[PDB]
Amino acid sequence: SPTELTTLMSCSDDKTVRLWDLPSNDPTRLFTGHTDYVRCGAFMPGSANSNLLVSGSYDETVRVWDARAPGGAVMTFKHADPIEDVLPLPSGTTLLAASGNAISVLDLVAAKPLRLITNHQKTVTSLSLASQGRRVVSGSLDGHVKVFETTSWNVVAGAKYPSPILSLSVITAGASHDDRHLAVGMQSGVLSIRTRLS
Amino acid sequence: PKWSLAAAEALCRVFVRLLAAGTIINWLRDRLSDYDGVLLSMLQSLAVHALVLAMAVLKAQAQHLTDREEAIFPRSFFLEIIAVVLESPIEHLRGHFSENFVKKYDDIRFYTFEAIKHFLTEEDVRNNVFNLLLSIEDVPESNDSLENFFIERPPKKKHPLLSLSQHKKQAQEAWLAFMHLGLSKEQRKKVLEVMSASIAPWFTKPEMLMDFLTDCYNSGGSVSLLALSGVFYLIQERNLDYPEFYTKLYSLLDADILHSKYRSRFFRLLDTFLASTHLPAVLVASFIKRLARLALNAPPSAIVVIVPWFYNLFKKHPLTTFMMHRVPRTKEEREKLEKDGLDDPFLPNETDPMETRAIDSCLWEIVQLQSHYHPNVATICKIISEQFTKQAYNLEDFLDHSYGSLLEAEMTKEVKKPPVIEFMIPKHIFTKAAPEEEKKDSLLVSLWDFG
Amino acid sequence: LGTVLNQALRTDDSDLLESCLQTLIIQNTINRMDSSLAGTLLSKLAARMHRRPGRAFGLMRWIQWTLVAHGGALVTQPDLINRLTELSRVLEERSRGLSSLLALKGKLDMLDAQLKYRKALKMAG
Amino acid sequence: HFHQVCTPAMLAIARYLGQKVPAALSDFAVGIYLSILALQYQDFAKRYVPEMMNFLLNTLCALAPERAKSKLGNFPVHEPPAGIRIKDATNTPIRQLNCGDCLRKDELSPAETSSLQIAILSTATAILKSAADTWHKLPAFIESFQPALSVAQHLLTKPNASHLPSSLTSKLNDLASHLSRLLQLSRLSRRPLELHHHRPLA
Amino acid sequence: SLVSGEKTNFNHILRLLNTNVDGKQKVVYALTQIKGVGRRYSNLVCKKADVDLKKRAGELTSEELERLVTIIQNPLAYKI
């Protein structure tokens, strides 16, 4: 959890995500509701959303739970693709669910999907946030990396790697969090690091 | 004509002597031109030794009809030889030319590809050049793996004969000339058979094979079942993709594909496709359930393939093993199940395996197929029924089995251990009624008139 | 190369487009292409058009056959006129020199041909 | 379980009965004979012969009053190559098969062909009745004989009833009501699978 | 939805020359599990076959496994 230093979430494979407290030897809370593999998860950053989890399953469902009511999903969203990745925005309102050949920007303040964005040919694998929370970079199994603006969501820049890529993240150096260098891990098994200095 | 052939070898000998040695030179090369005519006749004739003679005079020509260091050799005359060899139906001539010259020497391969491109740009001849193009099987690996030429390994270091991409280029151009002309049905079946091992590696760029393959793949049938390997090879190498690959696979797996012959190759590709990691449990359960309902009418050499593969899928994806052991949780559910029997929630003939309800089904088909007539098939379904001890079963042990293999197996067992017979045999083997023994008639007789 | 072009167009590739286009099959591709992909295709060729103006001999043929086959696709797809007019002034930059370069070819060709005449005299001299 | 001579012959039947797209009424008759023979091989040992199932279903849909349009089981539907199909001959009566029908005849009269075809059809209906009555167990009964009821109703359709004689209508209505009764029994008695109830070791 | 898991099947019990049981522990500790081999001996074996000690048992290819078998078979024809 980005706020509490001793609380973590875990999406297993079976049907469950669960919140653990580090000193304890038992899950603090248990959350069900999915029906297939669940394989992406995130906390909700922001001040008001202190305890909200989002998880994307392979049952084409992105669910967001409150950690105060250990029942069902507070909100759910059903796509038509296996949902591989999820990131919230640092603003706390909108969310990106990367599922199949298209990512989907969804609103949580109105529980209504904003826009389906298709640009990739095999499935998209991993999203990451970039330069100042201002650009979402996406990495897809077509060996393709493509960075979008987040205001109007047009395909701003991109590049191609010699192998299908699986995980991707630009990482920051330090003060003011300028993106130091971007890493991409591909199927062939090599970590490609592209570095920029300033 | 054996004295004519001895004359031919003698003239070849003196010709290579004068070429390695050397108002008159006009006739001195007129000897070579009318010997080219004589040699084309002797190739239309023994033709194998005239063909070796042809390669000898070509080597001599390349060596010394010039002033420069470079050895050029006549694409025109070699194209004439290619014309006569590939028009002449002499299979032994063609077999010699394939094994000794093309499948050995890189320059012969390269210029043969180019001359084939020319000769094909300008039906029996088509089938023959197809046989030769299949006869070129192995691809050289690297620029330093070429490393054997017939004439003049060029010292340029950037010569197209030394650049491996030019070899692939000319092979690609010959195969495209063949396809742009057009090929028949048995030929397209042979190419879609031999494509992923011998054809697409011979291309600099395999993208025309991708387009032709997705045409033949979305066509349908055993042609698509063959095309699967080429499409997978393309996706593997240059990640050109299919729109809906897994749903196309699920709708591809159909009635007669188990009985179809190419099921060994199909099952190897299917093994990789379902050994991939990013695959939902509902989808792998859908593959399992549809394949079990088709195993209900599969042949035994297909059931022995399908079952240990099922065991490996169950060891890998334990969310699917609820299709072998599903205790009804609530006593209300148990009471409902006792009142009305459980109907299978599986929906056959559904488009998407993501939305078939294979989860909440069971392997009733496999527990029934336990009672198969063959003992080996019965024991192999009993491996699903019994316990999970061995960690995996390699499929190579179970593939490539046939009725011929089962019959040779029941042959290659011992001649006879002392066997058992049937006591109290009736005398009314073919009697229609026999109402004085009260043993019921054999149904064979009760439904077959013998008279 | 239909699905190849189709992938490269809808994925905004570069090198795959190069692999399929830098070389009949051209007409077959444009027959099997799809519609908004042809619109993006003309856009990408306009980029290549202005960027390096060396070999027109392939790409003008590609644009030609595209306007033939899926030209009427762009007609009912008509919000993207800017993709046509961003090329349409690019080609009116491409006509400039034909006002005067032809007159340079004439004045220069005789200097070639006079050499050619003293070179056709040279074997006999 | 395992023999040294018996299951060889059964395996030969399995090869002949799963393979061999039928090219003649001789092939059809030899297949019917081997089908009823394999049923005799599996009487009072309730095993399953899937090649016999798909073969009987294939002959039944290959007798082609009209055609197999779509949605008829998952067994290999094959084509009648030389018009090997019944016609507008409802007045010929059924008869019992004779061994001479295993001999190929390119010169056969239309009346003899119609009688032999209807004979194979009625005897196949008999073999299906016997196979259901021996395999009302084996809990894939529903998924093994929903094709049989579906093809019985497919022949029960009126553009086939125009060519089908009334005796086959009676027999197929018998088979349909019988298989419906068996399917409802198996639907009531079908239980979920609990295979792995394992005693732990000591 | 297709990612090559060509390496994930390595937590299986491997077979070797004397023991038919050799799990995934490490290369040098797996060869220690092999009967008659000491720890420094297995280190010498791995360094002779040029297999990296970081790599596990079951992360190997068949030709590397076979040359490991040949060099555990003969320790003298290889230098020692």
> SS3 sequence, chain B?
CHHHHHHHHHHHHHHHHHHHHCCCHHHHHHHHHHHHHHHHHHHHCCHHHHHHHHHHHHHHHHHHCCCCCCCCCCHHHHHHHHHHHHHCCCHHHHHHHHHHHHCCCHHHHHHHHHHHHHHHHCCHHHHHHHHHHHHCCCCCCCHHHHCCCCCCCCCCCCCCCCCHHHHHHHHHHHHHHHHHHCCCHHHHHHHHHHHHHHCHHHCCCCHHHHHHHHHHHHHCCHHHHHHHHHHHHHHHHCCCCCCCHHHHHHHHCCCCCCCCCCHHHHHHHHHHHHHCCCCCHHHHHHHHHHHHHHHCCCCHHHHHHHHHHHHHHHHHCCCHHHHCECCCCCHHHHHHHHHCCCCCCCCCCCCCCCCCCCCCCCCHHHHHHCCECCHHHHHHHHHHHHCCCCCCCCHHHCCCCCHHHHHHHHHHCCCCCCCCCCCCCCCCCCCCCCCCCCCCCCHHHHCCCCC
Q: Which residue of C has its CA nearest to B173?
A: C23
Cβ pair B283, A60 in contact under 8 A: no
Strand-pair category, A83-88 with A155-160: unpaired
| Crossing angle of helices B222-237 and B207-219, rounded to 10° | 150
Instruction: Give chain A's length.
Output: 198
For residue B331, how many other CB atoms are within 10 A of its CB?
8
Cβ pair B266, B298 in contact under 8 A: no
Chain C: partners with 3+ C-beta pairs within 8 Å: A, B
Strand-pair category, A102-107 with A17-21: unpaired
Q: Please list, residue by residue across E28-37, b when 16 or more beta carbons sit within 10 angstroms of its beta carbon and e when fewer do.
A: bebbbbbeeb
For D48, the enclosing helix (H) or strand (E) is none
To the nearest whole Å, the CA of E11 is away from the closest chain B CA by 9
What's phi and psi for B352, nearest 5 deg?
A: -100, 125
User: Using a CB-CB distance cutoff of 8 angstroms, which residues of chain B are in contact with residue D139?
Assistant: 364, 367-368
Closest CB from B208, B238, B241 relative to C1: B208
Instruction: Give chain D's length.
Output: 202
For D122, the enclosing helix (H) or strand (E) is helix D110-134
Q: Report the residue of B263, B304, B371, B402 to disrupt the D interface, i.e. the one with the largest count of D CBs within 10 Å.
A: B371
Closest CA to D58 of D10, D128, D156, D11: D128
> Which residue bears the tokens 């020509």?
B61
Closest CB from A121, A155, A160 relative to C7: A121
For residue B210, how many other CB atoms are within 10 A of its CB?
28
Closest CA to B344 of B280, B289, B284, B288: B289
End-to-end CA distance of chain C: 57
A146 touches chain C (CB under 8 A): yes
DSSP D94: P
Record the tokens describing residue C36, joined without a space.
Answer: 């908004």
| Crossing angle of helices B207-219 and C2-11, rounded to 10° | 110
Chains A and E touch (3+ CB pairs under 8 A): yes
Round to whole Å and give the CA distance between D81 and D102: 18
To the nearest whole Å, the CA of D110 is away from the closest chain B CA by 22
CA E36 distance to own-chain centroid:
15
In sequence order, which residues have a C-beta less than 8 Å from that of residue A192 and are 6 or more positions away? Answer: A161, A183, A184, A185, A186
Check residue A46 and give left, alpha or beta (phi > 0: left; psi -120 to 50: alpha).
left
The SS3 of residue E6 is coil
Are the Cβ atoms of C12 and A119 closer than 8 angstroms? yes
Cβ pair B76, B115 in contact under 8 A: no
> Which residue bears the tokens 């690091």?
A193
Chain B: partners with 3+ C-beta pairs within 8 Å: A, C, D, E
**What CA–CA distances, in Å, run from C87 to B2, C12, C53, C63, C93?**
73, 19, 13, 11, 10
| Contact map slice: E 2-21 vs A, CB within 8 A | 2-4
Cβ pair A62, A34 in contact under 8 A: no
Closest CB from D4, D140, D190 relative to B417: D4
CA B139 distance to own-chain centroid:
17
Cβ pair A96, A87 in contact under 8 A: yes
To the nearest whole Å, the CA of C2 is away from the closest chain B CA by 6
Could you give the strand order of the β-sheet that contains A7-11, starting from the edge strand earlier in sequence?
A7-11, A17-21, A27-31
What's phi and psi for E22, nearest 5 deg?
A: -155, 105
Chain E: partners with 3+ C-beta pairs within 8 Å: A, B
Round to whole Å and give the CA distance between D37 and D169: 26
Q: Which ranges of C1-125 would DSSP assign to H, the alpha helix?
A: 2-11, 15-21, 25-32, 35-51, 56-69, 71-76, 81-88, 101-120
Q: Please list, residue by residue across D185-199, b when 16 or more beta carbons sit within 10 angstroms of its beta carbon and e when fewer do.
A: ebeeebebbebeeee
Cβ pair B185, B123 in contact under 8 A: no
Record the tokens describing residue B434, joined without a space.
Answer: 């026999």
Round to whole Å and give the CA distance between D153 and D165: 15
For residue A185, how many other CB atoms are within 10 A of its CB?
19
Burial label, D98 (beta-carbon count in 10 A; 0-12, 13-18, 19+): middle
Are the Cβ atoms of E1 and A82 closer than 8 angstroms? yes
Burial label, C120 (beta-carbon count in 10 A; 0-12, 13-18, 19+): exposed
Round to whole Å and give the CA distance between C22 and B230: 24
Closest CB from C4, C24, C32 relative to B210: C4
Q: Report the residue of B169, B203, B205 to disrupt the C interface, i.e. the one with the largest count of C CBs within 10 Å.
A: B205
Q: Report the residue of B231, B232, B239, B357 to disrupt the A interface, i.e. the one with the largest count of A CBs within 10 Å.
A: B239
Round to whole Å and give the CA distance between B196 and B227: 9
Record the tokens describing residue B218, joined without a space.
Answer: 């979305």
> Which residue bears the tokens 């169950």?
B314
End-to-end CA distance of chain B: 70
Strand-pair category, A102-107 with A27-31: unpaired
Record the tokens describing residue E73, joined without a space.
Answer: 């078979």
Rg (CA), chain B: 33
To the nearest whole Å, the CA of A13 is away from the closest chain E CA by 16
Cβ pair D132, D179 in contact under 8 A: yes
For D110, the enclosing helix (H) or strand (E) is helix D110-134
Chain A: partners with 3+ C-beta pairs within 8 Å: B, C, E
Closest CA to D186 of B368, B372, B366: B368
Handedness of CA C4, C8, C11, C14 (dihedral sign): positive
Record the tokens describing residue A9, joined without a space.
Answer: 């979430």
Are the Cβ atoms of B241 and A122 closer than 8 angstroms? yes
Chain B / chain E CB contacts < 8 angstroms: 22
User: Using a CB-CB distance cutoff of 8 angstroms, which residues of chain B are in contact with residue C3?
Assistant: 210-211, 214, 240
Round to whole Å and give the CA distance between B382 and B369: 9
DSSP C16-31: HHHHHH---HHHHHHH
Closest CA to B345 of B367, B368, B362: B362
DSSP D3: -
The SS3 of residue D115 is helix
User: Using a CB-CB distance cutoff of 8 angstroms, which residues of chain B are in contact with residue C19?
Assistant: 205, 207
What's phi and psi for C20, nearest 5 deg?
A: -90, -20
Are the Cβ atoms of B278 and E13 closer than 8 angstroms? no
**What CA–CA distances, in Å, run from D195 to B286, B331, B383?**
20, 20, 12
> Which residue bears the tokens 């130091």?
A180
Closest CA to C62 of C88, C107, C35, C24: C24
Angle at alpha carbon of residue A52, lines to A51 and A58, rounded to 5°: 145
Chain D: partners with 3+ C-beta pairs within 8 Å: B
Closest CA to B261 of B377, B369, B404: B404
Closest CA to B51 of B111, B16, B94, B18: B94
Closest CA to B351 of B222, B215, B248: B248
Are the Cβ atoms of B282 and A141 closer than 8 angstroms? no
The SS3 of residue D140 is coil
The SS3 of residue E22 is strand
Are the Cβ atoms of A187 and E1 closer than 8 angstroms? no
Cβ pair D51, D39 in contact under 8 A: no
Cβ pair B441, B434 in contact under 8 A: yes
Our CA dihedral for D12, D15, D19, D22, rounded to 10 degrees, sits at 10
Amino acid code (one letter) for E75: P
> Which residue bears the tokens 């018996």?
D6
The SS3 of residue A34 is coil
Round to whole Å and give the CA distance between A51 and A39: 20
Q: Report the residue of D3, D5, D6, D11 to disrupt the B interface, i.e. the one with the largest count of B CBs within 10 Å.
A: D11
For residue B234, how many other CB atoms are within 10 A of its CB?
25
Record the tokens describing residue C99, joined without a space.
Answer: 């006002």
Round to whole Å and give the CA distance between B285 and B348: 13
Are the Cβ atoms of B447 and D127 closer than 8 angstroms? yes
Side-chain-facing half-sphere of D155: CA atoms under 13 Å: 33
In sequence order, which residues have a C-beta less than 8 Å from that of residue B44 and are 6 or more positions away? Answer: B84, B88
CA C56 distance to own-chain centroid:
4
Record the tokens describing residue D162, joined without a space.
Answer: 């125009």
To the nearest whole Å, the CA of D172 is away from the closest chain B CA by 17
Are the Cβ atoms of E3 and A141 closer than 8 angstroms? yes
User: Using a CB-CB distance cutoff of 8 angstroms, which residues of chain D are in contact with residue B343?
Assistant: 187, 190
Closest CA to D7 of D61, D45, D62: D45
- Beta-bridge partner residues of A136: A129, A148
User: Using a CB-CB distance cutoff of 8 angstroms, which residues of chain E are in contact with residue A141?
Assistant: 2-3
Cβ pair B301, B401 in contact under 8 A: yes
User: Own/partner pairs for D24-27, CB < 8 Å, 24+ apart?
Assistant: D24/D82, D24/D84, D24/D104, D25/D84, D25/D101, D25/D108, D25/D113, D25/D116, D25/D117, D25/D120, D26/D101, D26/D102, D26/D103, D26/D104, D26/D105
Q: Which residue of E has its CA nearest to A58?
A: E1
Record the tokens describing residue B439, joined without a space.
Answer: 């043993």
Are the Cβ atoms of B337 and D191 closer than 8 angstroms? yes
Instruction: Give chain B's length.
Output: 451
| Contact map slice: C 8-67 vs B, CB within 8 A | 16, 19-20, 24-25, 32
For residue C112, how many other CB atoms are within 10 A of its CB?
10
**What CA–CA distances, in Å, run from C24 to B174, B178, C33, C44, C67?**
15, 14, 14, 22, 16
Check residue B160 and give left, alpha or beta (phi > 0: left; psi -120 to 50: alpha).
alpha
To the nearest whole Å, the CA of A123 is away from the closest chain E CA by 7
B250 touches chain E (CB under 8 A): no
The SS3 of residue A33 is coil
Closest CB from E8, E12, E13 relative to B277: E8
To the nearest whole Å, the CA of A137 is away from the closest chain E CA by 20
A121 touches chain E (CB under 8 A): no
The SS3 of residue A96 is strand
To the nearest whole Å, the CA of B117 is away from the closest chain D CA by 42
Residues after which chain B is broken (C–N above 2.5 A) are 22, 45, 122
E7 touches chain B (CB under 8 A): no
> Which residue bears the tokens 């190897």?
B268
Check residue D138 and give left, alpha or beta (phi > 0: left; psi -120 to 50: alpha).
left
What's phi and psi for A127, nearest 5 deg?
A: -105, 160
To the nearest whole Å, the CA of A58 is away from the closest chain B CA by 6
B239 touches chain E (CB under 8 A): no
Round to whole Å and give the CA distance between D149 and B237: 48
Record the tokens describing residue B259, joined without a space.
Answer: 């009985």
The SS3 of residue D57 is helix
In sequence order, which residues have a C-beta less than 8 Å from that of residue A177 and are 6 or more positions away? Answer: A132
Chains B and A touch (3+ CB pairs under 8 A): yes
A123 touches chain E (CB under 8 A): yes
Angle at alpha carbon of residue E16, lines to E10 and E17, rounded to 5°: 175
- Resolution of the experimental model in angstroms, please? 4.0
Chains B and C touch (3+ CB pairs under 8 A): yes
**What CA–CA distances, in Å, run from C52 to A1, C46, C48, C55, C59?**
52, 10, 6, 8, 12
For A9, the enclosing helix (H) or strand (E) is strand A7-11
Closest CA to D43 of B50, B218, B440: B440
For D7, the enclosing helix (H) or strand (E) is helix D6-18
For residue C78, how many other CB atoms are within 10 A of its CB?
8
